[PDB]
Amino acid sequence: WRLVEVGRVVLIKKGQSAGKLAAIVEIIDQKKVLIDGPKAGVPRQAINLGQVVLTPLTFALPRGARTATVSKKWAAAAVCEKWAASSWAKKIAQRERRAALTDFERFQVMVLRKQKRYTVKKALAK
Amino acid sequence: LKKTRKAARPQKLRASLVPGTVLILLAGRFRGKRVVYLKHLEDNTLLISGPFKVNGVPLRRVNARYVIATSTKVSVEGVNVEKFNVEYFAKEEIKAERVEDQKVVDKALIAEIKKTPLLKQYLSASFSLKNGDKPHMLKF
Amino acid sequence: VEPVVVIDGKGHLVGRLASVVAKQLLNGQKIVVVRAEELNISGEFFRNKLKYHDFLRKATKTRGPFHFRAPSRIFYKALRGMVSHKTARGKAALERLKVFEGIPPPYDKKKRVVVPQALRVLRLKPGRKYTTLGKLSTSVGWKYEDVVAKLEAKRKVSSAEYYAKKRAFTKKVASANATAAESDVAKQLAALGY
Amino acid sequence: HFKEYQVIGRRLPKLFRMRIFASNEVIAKSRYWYFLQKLHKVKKASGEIVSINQINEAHPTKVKNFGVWVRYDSRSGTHNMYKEIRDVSRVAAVETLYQDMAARHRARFRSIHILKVAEIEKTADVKRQYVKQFLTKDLKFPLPHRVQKSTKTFSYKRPSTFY
Amino acid sequence: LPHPKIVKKHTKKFKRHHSDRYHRVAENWRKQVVRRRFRGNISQPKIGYGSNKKTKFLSPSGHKTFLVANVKDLETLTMHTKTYAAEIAHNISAKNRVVILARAKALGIKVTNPKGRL
Amino acid sequence: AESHRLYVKGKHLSYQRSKRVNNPNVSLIKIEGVATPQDAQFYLGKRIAYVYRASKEVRGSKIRVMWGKVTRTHGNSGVVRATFRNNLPAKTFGASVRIFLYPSNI
RNA sequence: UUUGCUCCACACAAUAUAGAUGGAUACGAAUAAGGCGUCCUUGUGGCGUCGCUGAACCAUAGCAGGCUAGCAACGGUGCACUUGGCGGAAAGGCCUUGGGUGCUUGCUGGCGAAUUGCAAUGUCAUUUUGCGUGGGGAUAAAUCAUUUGUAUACGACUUAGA
RNA sequence: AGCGAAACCACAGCCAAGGCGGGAAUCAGC
RNA sequence: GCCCUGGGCGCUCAAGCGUGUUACCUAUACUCUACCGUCAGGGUUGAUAUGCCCUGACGAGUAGGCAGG
RNA sequence: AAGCUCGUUCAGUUUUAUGUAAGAAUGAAGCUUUUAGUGGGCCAUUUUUGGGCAGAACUGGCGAUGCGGGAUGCCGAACGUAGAGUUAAGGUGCCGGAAUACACGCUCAAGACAAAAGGUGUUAG
RNA sequence: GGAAUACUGCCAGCUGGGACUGAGGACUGCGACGUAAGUCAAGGAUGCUGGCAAAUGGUUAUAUGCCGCCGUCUUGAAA
């Protein structure tokens, strides 16, 4: 069960920082918290919980850590590598690439899909 | 009639249209087929080739607004398209020249098409939409 | 979009579900409602029961008010007031609607759908009272609830065996895909998004 | 979205000074003129606004337990009220107080007077439990019954509210 | 040619209010809720419906219809053949109709209603 | 290919109107998949075609088609206003429509 | 009623669509948790992990989709049969054994595409009905009349008879 | 089984309430 | 602050209440343009006329008055 | 409407004089004479009368008034016939054309004259 | 100590997508380009192309989306 806490890494859902990762530095109240993400370039600002979704990853961060301290802790924890290995980041990247596919790329994808399907069907029953 | 001041400024083509680009026709007998752009004609039409030997689409004049542009491009520098002109389509059953010229044009492009893998079969397949397709999102 | 959409009334709200179904019908979309006996309405049982009993006695005098007992017919009446009935456009829209208690065939062998914004659990605040509708129908005169449950119990059976067979088939397909991984075609597909 | 401005006046002297929160300088000037009559006997034509300048937060990057003294004109007279609000800036803290007053007492910009706002740098100084609970050591709590805005009209997975 | 789109503005001919319900009431327009131009009621003819001067009285063929009943009248249009077309009155016998048509064809004047009683 | 579709499908809702006044000169057309006016901006200027069948054989075929055009977006749900040289009959409320991909610019 | 009635095969027309233009693409239960794969000292159990949308899954390449050649398997699949099971809620559908017969774009080639002239939905779905043949199936019922008397204001109702 | 009118006739009517207004045809009660 | 005693369907973290922030719906209202008319100004004949024109404004309405068919 | 003749003279327009010499601002005439019709009350307001009610001195609005909104009877806006775009009032769950939009709390029965009083009803100083 | 950025206002800055409008009728006028001929988005649209012996469209019936008995009367517009 994901819980909001200092150092918790989160994904922004909407806004200019949408799709970027941030970390909770200090909780302001029940509905608003302070987040930061120097690596992603998102400026230090407060945000409401409704506009952000909590990720399952977590790292230790000093309470009220400044931008430099937040960046240093983020780099030390290497949470970015863990995020990429997560199935959620993989799905996001897959969706982005699929949406970026060209028509000729889509035709090649269809050809490869048919080739794979032939072998997969041949592998069954046997 | 007063001297209307409206000069015949030359047409300006969108940057997405470049010679050798793969075109898609949305209207006509060849609607849904993939074609290769060659040259822009004085009549504001686009000179294109199937090529004929690959998908059966001959050299035809088409309008840009009915053509969807694609990023895939092929070499078209070796094809001498200067022979074709607006007068080449006047009529005032296939003409003899229409076959030899088409074959000559396709000879200098079939090799280029075969250079890129799966490009020949890609052109041989007619483009069509599918359930759930969102053309605005798709880059084409 | 599917030619016909089947909506599962389980855990849903009568008001929002009826509103969305009517809006879709006006747009020219065919919709069918199943498991209507399990639909839910906001508020406690007493409030909903009184709101319905008072309706039965408000008079037009039998030409107007009808003491209709079927919960599916109650839902249709709820949706009836959200459509421009007594007109060709509204009446034609209602022609694309059907409501059945439980899931009778051939809808059983077809994929049902749910409305995310009409879920009773999703929109109703946790801890607040709610009405199951089935009890209201039983109390107001409905008597087929027992038979409905009895013949719906068989629906869960057989369907469970079909799900088990599909689970085995998907297990085999997943194994085939796993052993199929690392292939050149699979690697190319992964590189090209897919 | 309020804004903090410093407005002074002297009826064309003592140079009366106060802080005014308004969405724009025009509203700030009107509020300053209105407060002048309450503070003393002055009229708009008496003089002119010597200077008006917007005040920006020294550092809108720190959480501050703002202590605010606010007087409002209820339906039966005006009463002095004091509250503590946890926020990051004075502009947001005063807006939150205004929204809370409008939600409960139904007091709005027309009948709300801002007296003083000051930060609290020591624990146990805030006497309000609703703010005191957040002053403890790094804590954790869940967000049960989360929901997602389903753009599609139809859903096939029966979405769950888990977080 | 000088035959631009002739907008009739209001093609539907006006009818007397309530004339359909009562037989005795003729369809000829006559003034009296209609006087108050209430919503959903027949519109009242007014100055807004005036046709453009440059296209007033012009038939769809872009020529004015001029009644003719003698050779002299038809010849009078020799100067204005470009704009005025000939029209034979209903009282003209078929005997003179042939002569009128022949003269109009020889002078290039179009006949709005040819083949009359022929 | 089994599918030969080259036009984006949609639905016809109702003409531009108020609470009690409706102007049939403007038709509100809903396009499948569109959700916001920003997405609908791409469909502006695209020809809209309605296809219906009649028992009588018209001069060219048994099919009759109306040729319209797109004008501007409508609402926050992505609805787009459509104008036709001849307004569609009111009986087609809720019926489907064909939105072609031309004239295009991509 | 010149198979008159009926169900079928092919076969030409009218009739229109409340409105295809790839696929309604099947568990249950909770929403302060459920699945998936595994373990089993089988449980409200342990382990790895999935959600945060279908923005997907199945399919989709060929004159609107033809002819033909070669390679690898006998897999995929359009269709006529056949053994058997399930589906009574509106079951009227789900399939299952075995071959037969086309395609197979899983892979590699040879053929025609044009003239609709720069586009005119460029005509491919069935709902109902009408007329022309052949492959079978069965050949009845009701009203009046006659009358009844349980019925009976008059209708009506209830009867017996080749 | 006769012989053939008069009165009347803008047009209405099945009721829930306020702006004083939710179906073939004939036979039996007022 | 709200509750209890004191338009239809339905709505309940409202689709109720107060307030703050954006977008959208459309009157004969407003802004650009096509046309009729009235009102005002001006060009007009070493002939181009109660005519051929250019520019602007205006267009509700009973009795009543005037003008044109 | 009817002659003159001044092109300037005027104003339901706004502050200092003490109501104005205003070379303060803003906008843009006069005497006549005879010629049809014209004898209502009212919505709100004003002066603010007393004990329910009844007259009343006044200022905006109809009579002759369309149109959008309020299911229908005050707000907006006052009207040639048309094409195009933005709005007022009023709305954006369906009927009903428009966001089941965002943010702060409230409420269990409401919600689109009774407030004199009570509640171990709920949330704040 | 240093920039950056949010916000405000300007661009006689650039570059597109979409909707309606083509109104005037041989040149006289104000402007830009050019060393000059001449050109121009500069006191109102031109150039090219395709389908056609019923073409476009009109009256009418019927069904769909919305709207909705008369003259005189008191005169408060009224039943």
Side-chain angles (χ1 to χ4, degrees):
Chain A
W1 200 0
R2 303 177 193 163
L3 322 170
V4 297
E5 54 180 307
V6 172
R8 175 71 72 160
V9 59
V10 302
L11 171 58
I12 296 156
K13 291 197 297 188
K14 181 61 73 71
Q16 187 161 12
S17 45
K20 292 171 185 174
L21 294 159
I24 292 163
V25 180
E26 194 148 38
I27 63 105
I28 298 161
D29 53 35
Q30 175 54 242
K31 306 300 298 306
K32 278 191 290 191
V33 297
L34 176 55
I35 64 105
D36 193 9
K39 207 191 181 292
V42 60
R44 207 156 170 287
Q45 57 169 90
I47 200 170
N48 312 67
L49 298 165
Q51 316 185 56
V52 52
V53 71
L54 314 171
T55 69
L57 301 174
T58 295
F59 73 97
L61 182 77
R63 215 200 90 260
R66 289 164 87 73
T67 310
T69 307
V70 170
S71 194
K72 194 209 298 187
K73 297 290 180 194
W74 184 284
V79 293
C80 298
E81 311 315 301
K82 299 161 190 167
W83 164 265
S86 74
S87 183
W88 182 229
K90 284 183 190 179
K91 188 167 175 176
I92 288 157
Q94 162 61 311
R95 285 202 299 209
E96 196 168 289
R97 192 71 254 285
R98 173 166 289 143
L101 284 170
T102 323
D103 178 58
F104 180 38
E105 291 186 356
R106 233 179 296 102
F107 180 86
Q108 295 169 247
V109 152
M110 163 170 90
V111 174
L112 298 160
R113 272 177 63 76
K114 294 267 278 280
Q115 289 175 0
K116 174 177 161 184
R117 187 217 303 175
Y118 190 96
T119 61
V120 173
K121 298 286 176 187
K122 184 165 68 166
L124 275 163
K126 295 173 72 172
Chain B
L1 285 299
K2 287 178 86 75
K3 295 290 108 186
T4 184
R5 322 193 286 199
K6 303 288 164 165
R9 214 143 281 101
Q11 165 172 27
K12 180 258 182 94
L13 298 106
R14 56 198 154 102
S16 70
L17 294 170
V18 185
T21 307
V22 169
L23 303 186
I24 304 173
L25 313 186
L26 296 161
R29 164 159 160 71
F30 317 130
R31 63 176 164 85
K33 286 266 202 289
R34 301 176 164 85
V35 196
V36 182
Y37 179 43
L38 306 177
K39 170 180 161 188
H40 154 247
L41 284 162
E42 311 309 322
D43 61 348
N44 308 328
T45 66
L46 307 179
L47 197 281
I48 69 190
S49 58
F52 185 80
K53 179 55 170 157
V54 158
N55 50 19
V57 188
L59 285 137
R60 288 243 303 194
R61 300 189 289 177
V62 72
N63 217 315
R65 289 289 183 179
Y66 294 82
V67 164
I68 281 164
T70 68
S71 67
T72 310
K73 294 155 179 176
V74 288
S75 165
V76 73
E77 290 80 33
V79 190
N80 192 359
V81 302
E82 302 298 333
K83 180 176 177 179
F84 283 75
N85 201 281
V86 178
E87 77 197 34
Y88 200 78
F89 296 88
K91 72 287 200 183
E92 180 160 25
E93 312 190 358
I94 299 159
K95 220 251 179 169
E97 220 80 4
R98 197 76 64 185
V99 182
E100 45 243 35
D101 285 336
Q102 187 77 53
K103 289 216 175 198
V104 173
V105 170
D106 292 356
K107 276 208 173 187
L109 181 58
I110 192 74
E112 276 65 43
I113 278 155
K114 290 184 289 189
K115 243 80 180 297
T116 40
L118 277 165
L119 200 281
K120 165 178 166 91
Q121 305 304 116
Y122 164 74
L123 296 176
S124 90
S126 292
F127 157 78
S128 67
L129 293 169
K130 285 96 203 182
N131 268 326
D133 284 359
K134 293 186 184 184
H136 55 276
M137 307 205 323
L138 295 170
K139 199 211 297 184
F140 288 91
Chain C
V1 70
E2 304 96 329
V4 170
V5 182
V6 173
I7 293 169
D8 192 343
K10 172 186 128 192
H12 270 93
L13 197 64
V14 67
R16 291 174 201 288
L17 175 55
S19 175
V20 300
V21 174
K23 166 55 67 174
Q24 293 295 109
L25 250 63
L26 269 307
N27 290 2
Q29 175 52 42
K30 309 192 176 68
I31 291 173
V32 176
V33 172
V34 291
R35 296 198 90 179
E37 82 303 330
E38 225 278 325
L39 197 61
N40 314 137
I41 315 186
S42 51
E44 55 166 10
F45 183 29
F46 294 173
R47 289 206 318 209
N48 282 286
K49 192 188 166 193
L50 266 48
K51 290 279 177 180
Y52 177 82
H53 195 72
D54 177 89
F55 200 170
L56 259 63
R57 63 104 185 173
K58 85 177 197 86
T60 184
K61 311 187 188 82
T62 189
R63 184 182 263 90
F66 278 105
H67 311 76
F68 238 81
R69 257 72 70 159
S72 52
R73 296 275 86 197
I74 289 166
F75 165 80
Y76 177 89
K77 161 172 76 79
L79 180 135
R80 181 173 164 195
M82 317 208 180
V83 179
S84 182
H85 77 315
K86 308 229 166 183
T87 59
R89 177 160 161 277
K91 279 197 169 185
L94 288 162
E95 181 169 343
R96 318 182 170 96
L97 175 62
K98 318 184 183 73
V99 202
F100 313 109
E101 283 77 352
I103 316 197
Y107 296 117
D108 279 319
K109 273 66 175 293
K110 305 195 160 56
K111 168 65 90 76
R112 59 200 60 79
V113 191
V114 291
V115 174
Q117 68 212 39
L119 254 298
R120 194 228 76 249
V121 73
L122 205 147
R123 297 300 311 271
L124 203 289
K125 203 171 85 78
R128 187 174 309 290
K129 285 284 191 176
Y130 65 95
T131 320
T132 47
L133 189 59
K135 266 69 180 193
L136 190 140
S137 61
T138 311
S139 59
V140 297
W142 201 43
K143 60 182 81 173
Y144 303 143
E145 186 174 47
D146 296 293
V147 176
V148 166
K150 179 171 173 187
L151 103 173
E152 274 280 287
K154 183 171 71 166
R155 210 291 318 291
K156 296 173 175 179
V157 190
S158 321
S159 52
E161 278 63 51
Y162 155 79
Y163 160 67
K165 211 284 214 302
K166 189 171 180 176
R167 188 172 55 201
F169 195 81
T170 51
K171 221 187 203 169
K172 287 178 72 167
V173 167
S175 71
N177 275 280
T179 185
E182 308 107 49
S183 60
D184 304 279
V185 294
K187 291 280 283 196
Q188 198 71 84
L189 280 160
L192 303 179
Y194 283 56
Chain D
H1 195 48
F2 284 108
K3 274 108 175 182
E4 185 172 54
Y5 305 89
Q6 173 163 247
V7 187
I8 51 170
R10 51 104 187 280
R11 67 157 81 77
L12 201 148
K14 303 183 178 176
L15 282 158
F16 309 112
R17 177 258 186 182
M18 73 195 304
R19 295 175 94 158
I20 305 297
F21 300 92
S23 305
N24 51 48
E25 295 175 341
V26 181
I27 294 159
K29 290 172 183 182
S30 187
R31 297 293 293 177
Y32 182 82
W33 283 121
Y34 163 77
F35 297 142
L36 285 207
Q37 282 96 41
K38 288 185 99 288
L39 285 157
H40 27 79
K41 300 289 177 75
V42 182
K43 58 178 183 182
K44 172 169 153 67
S46 70
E48 180 57 27
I49 301 297
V50 170
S51 182
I52 171 159
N53 288 81
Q54 196 186 126
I55 281 162
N56 320 323
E57 224 297 312
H59 38 288
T61 47
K62 170 182 168 206
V63 196
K64 307 137 186 266
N65 309 308
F66 283 109
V68 182
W69 297 258
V70 164
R71 200 192 183 86
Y72 80 119
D73 310 344
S74 88
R75 290 183 181 162
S76 316
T78 178
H79 321 306
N80 209 162
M81 199 186 290
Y82 166 66
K83 278 180 171 168
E84 284 96 333
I85 292 163
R86 190 166 168 81
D87 215 288
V88 178
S89 61
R90 300 160 64 80
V91 67
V94 66
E95 189 176 1
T96 47
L97 187 138
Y98 268 105
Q99 293 311 97
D100 180 28
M101 292 287 279
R104 288 182 167 77
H105 301 294
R106 264 146 179 71
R108 58 198 64 73
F109 187 60
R110 297 276 78 196
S111 295
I112 281 163
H113 289 48
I114 315 308
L115 310 178
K116 184 191 288 295
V117 178
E119 305 178 12
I120 298 163
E121 310 88 351
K122 293 194 184 177
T123 60
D125 294 52
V126 193
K127 290 146 283 202
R128 305 303 185 274
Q129 288 81 352
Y130 93 102
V131 165
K132 191 190 178 178
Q133 63 186 349
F134 300 122
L135 309 194
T136 63
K137 219 198 289 201
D138 304 5
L139 83 182
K140 327 183 183 199
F141 54 94
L143 300 174
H145 211 101
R146 66 142 186 195
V147 293
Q148 179 73 340
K149 187 180 195 72
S150 191
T151 50
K152 285 284 280 182
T153 49
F154 291 118
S155 184
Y156 309 88
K157 296 153 54 168
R158 187 80 75 165
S160 188
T161 201
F162 97 99
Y163 212 142
Chain E
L1 253 71
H3 52 68
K5 189 186 287 297
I6 304 107
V7 282
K8 310 308 304 197
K9 221 149 194 195
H10 202 267
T11 52
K12 276 199 180 183
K13 256 61 186 166
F14 294 83
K15 296 191 288 178
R16 184 161 182 190
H17 174 62
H18 223 69
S19 58
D20 310 283
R21 191 63 266 159
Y22 289 124
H23 192 99
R24 56 174 172 275
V25 189
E27 281 178 0
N28 307 69
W29 177 239
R30 268 119 176 79
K31 203 170 77 175
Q32 313 311 100
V33 290
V34 181
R35 192 186 63 74
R36 298 203 281 283
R37 61 191 71 153
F38 269 37
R39 179 179 67 190
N41 298 166
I42 60 180
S43 59
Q44 269 190 269
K46 45 173 75 197
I47 188 57
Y49 298 76
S51 298
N52 158 259
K53 309 145 174 90
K54 305 146 191 168
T55 57
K56 202 165 173 139
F57 306 107
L58 293 190
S59 69
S61 72
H63 276 143
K64 285 176 178 282
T65 186
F66 182 70
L67 276 161
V68 72
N70 46 303
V71 179
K72 203 178 280 179
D73 275 31
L74 188 271
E75 285 181 343
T76 39
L77 300 179
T78 301
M79 293 293 145
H80 321 321
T81 61
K82 299 280 278 291
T83 319
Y84 290 87
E87 177 156 319
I88 292 159
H90 82 120
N91 55 18
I92 309 306
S93 54
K95 195 182 83 82
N96 292 310
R97 275 180 194 270
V98 173
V99 174
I100 291 158
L101 292 166
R103 293 288 91 185
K105 198 71 169 287
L107 294 176
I109 291 94
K110 185 176 178 187
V111 174
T112 57
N113 53 322
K115 316 184 302 314
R117 224 169 292 158
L118 256 295
Chain F
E2 271 64 36
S3 56
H4 287 78
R5 191 200 310 170
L6 300 174
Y7 53 88
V8 183
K9 68 218 302 196
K11 285 289 218 296
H12 180 215
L13 309 187
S14 181
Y15 316 130
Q16 165 172 41
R17 62 181 288 191
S18 310
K19 266 198 75 149
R20 299 171 190 74
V21 171
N22 55 347
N23 180 18
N25 290 288
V26 170
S27 300
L28 306 173
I29 297 293
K30 188 165 189 174
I31 304 176
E32 185 165 307
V34 185
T36 62
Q38 299 96 272
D39 293 331
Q41 282 293 126
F42 167 70
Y43 297 105
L44 301 183
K46 303 284 153 54
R47 321 304 292 227
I48 290 163
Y50 177 78
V51 178
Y52 59 102
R53 307 249 170 165
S55 288
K56 191 180 196 182
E57 187 178 309
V58 297
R59 180 165 137 81
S61 172
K62 266 197 175 167
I63 320 301
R64 317 190 200 201
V65 197
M66 277 176 281
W67 205 239
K69 273 213 293 184
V70 178
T71 57
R72 52 186 278 195
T73 61
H74 189 105
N76 296 346
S77 300
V79 179
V80 72
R81 311 189 202 195
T83 54
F84 301 74
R85 291 194 273 90
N86 286 296
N87 301 347
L88 315 180
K91 194 179 283 191
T92 56
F93 277 25
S96 184
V97 286
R98 309 192 170 192
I99 303 98
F100 282 92
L101 267 51
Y102 49 81
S104 206
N105 189 72
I106 51 163

